[PDB]
Ligand code: HEM
């Protein structure tokens with residue numbers, strides 16, 4: 001559950017990410033596949049060649065999905081229902097993988113935005129990703 | 142995130158569970174302290190002898206809180222903020238312990254109400270207890 | 283796992299009463315219903331797209347029996363769970379990539395099923411000895427990760 | 429933990445640049461901020477009721493230093509983590525009752541802090557080798573539960 005303070009930290013930090021969302025998306029996904037090889041089992045059709053157009057295209061969609069969530073913090077299940085159908089009903093992704101991707105996204109944001117990634121903003125982003133992860137692993141329709 | 146069907150399963154099960162709420166509470170707690178002795182370190186002032194007045198009184202309160210929750214499925218953060226103050230801000234309970242009490246509660250409900258404890262009701266109650274747990278371990282005020 | 287002789291007698295006494303035909307299918311079946319991501323491991327079993335289809339699926343019942351037969355073996359071998367489950371640890375960890383959180387979930391679901399079946403007989407004390415056993419089993423199945 | 433020479437060179441090269449005073453304090457400090465139940469284990473350090481109090485607290489910096497020094501030691505003993513960490517595992521598991529999942533969280537926070545400090549140099553490939561290392565260390569700290 002997000003506090004009013006968490007909501008502000010998220011909205012503020014997301015402003016600073018600007019137009020590079022897509023590129024951070026792709027890097028977090030690449031860090032995931034390399035550091036946690038069992039995750040590739042969910043993408044048997046991907047080319048995992050560094051900088052692949054597929055991974056690039058995928059990172060873009062993930063960062064669009066996060067931008068949309070930041071816009072709908074008071075109704076995540078509302079905003080993300082289609083992605084929940086995909087991950088929870090169709091793909092049946094083990095919730096453990098969500099913690100791995102969330103961690104890789106934090107690693108990536110800290111890597112590019114060290115001065116914005118203060119301990120308090122790190123705390124609020126971790127909670128943001130945990131909340132997003134619950135929704136995408138829950139069957140609620 | 143609870144589906145409409147989960148909400149109906151929880152409400153209708155909780156009707157059956159009814160006037161014995163307090164007794165199930167006491168038994169789930171006692172099962173937790175015996176099964177998972179590390180949880181007792183949060184209760185240094187309790188007498189842990191099986192008949193204990195303290196345990197029975199505490200069991201009853203945990204039961205009242207769950208009953209209250211069932212009346213407020215659409216707004217758990219709102220109904221449960223005083224308990225979040227206590228568990229998250231003051232006691233700082235490690236979230237692992239919530240999975241232990243939630244498991245003991247299910248053990249106890251399956252014990253006394255095997256007819257109501259179908260696989261679909263077991264599913265909805267687990268998610269109910271997971272949602273309650275997330276509220277009580279989160280700082281959101 | 284180390285159980286006192288009183289714990290060991292409580293465990294074995296209750297286990298002797300278990301319907302090895304049915305409890306396994308009930309525990310596996312509930313795991314798949316309550317923790318729906320686990321269905322992904324068992325897609326070869328057919329349609330698991332509802333509670334009714336899961337619990338009536340014969341491959342689920344046949345598999346549940348095999349799981350329970352393994353728990354039985356472990357009970358005869360508590361002071362060497364690691365070597366008893368070595369083959370199974372390699373299969374689940376190295377070929378199947380089951381995250382170890384899932385072994386713990388199955389262990390607890392089995393304790394839920396025991397309580398459901400036995401009622402008052404499954405006392406808090408018998409349950410406590412069972413929690414030591416399922417933890418030993420989970421840990422033994424997870425050994426190849428560690 | 430088994431690293432190729434490629435992985436080991438990478439971990440070692442980066443590790444030689446680490447300021448242990450600084451990095452350990454920032455890792456332990458962020459642990460206590462991001463995962464606030466962990467503050468319970470460190471109540472004797474004083475008030476930890478805010479990010480700013482946590483990160484200016486001298487006992488937190490001094491403790492972060494001790495934690496990282498222990499990590500450095502684990503790094504030159506990768507093939508004997510269990511023997512190296514035996515007494516430390518006993519203390520955390522038997523005396524402090526720290527749930528093992530918290531060892532994983534502190535390992536991941538240390539990876540965040542390395543990324544924060546090193547930028548581009550902490551490549552996906554360097555990260556991947558560090559993940560093997562922190563999981564090895566977390567496992568060693570938890571073995572007394574097994
Ligand atoms: C922060 C959490 C996540 C977000 C916001 C997210 C978002 C998305 C989005 C936007 C898509 C594209 C939808 C489309 O096909 O139009 C997608 C697809 C997919 N996701 Fe995720 N995802 C998340 C976590 C995960 C995790 C942890 C995994 C498993 C490791 C995963 C596995 C997949 C797979 C296999 C696809 C389909 C790939 C394809 O066919 O191209 N997702 N996700």
Ligand code: HEM
Nearest residue numbers: 180183184202203206207224228232234238239242273274
């Ligand atoms: C479904 C989960 C839980 C619920 C609904 C719950 C509910 C409650 C309630 C209603 C009270 C009494 C509040 C008052 O009268 O002021 C309480 C107190 C307390 N809870 Fe929980 N709780 C839960 C989980 C836990 C867990 C997992 C632990 C740790 C193992 C824990 C530790 C405590 C402690 C130490 C107290 C104070 C006891 C005293 O001094 O009398 N709680 N809780």
Ligand code: HEM
Nearest residue numbers: 320323324348349352353370378380384385388389419423
């Ligand atoms: C107490 C924990 C568990 C025990 C004792 C256990 C036991 C077994 C046994 C005895 C087998 C058959 C191997 C053989 O052919 O001899 C097996 C296979 C298998 N297990 Fe488990 N298991 C456990 C937990 C899990 C979990 C949590 C999952 C996944 C969520 C899982 C997934 C599988 C799968 C997919 C197979 C292969 C099934 C097939 O191809 O027919 N197991 N396990």
Ligand code: HEM
Nearest residue numbers: 466469470494495498499524526530531534535565566569
């Ligand atoms: C995973 C890596 C960890 C390492 C390498 C580590 C290392 C250490 C070391 C070297 C000490 C000092 C022992 C001595 O006095 O000889 C210590 C003490 C301690 N650790 Fe950790 N630790 C880890 C994780 C954790 C976590 C995750 C927690 C809490 C959630 C924790 C809680 C404590 C506490 C309370 C002390 C005692 C501090 C005191 O003396 O007041 N440790 N640890």
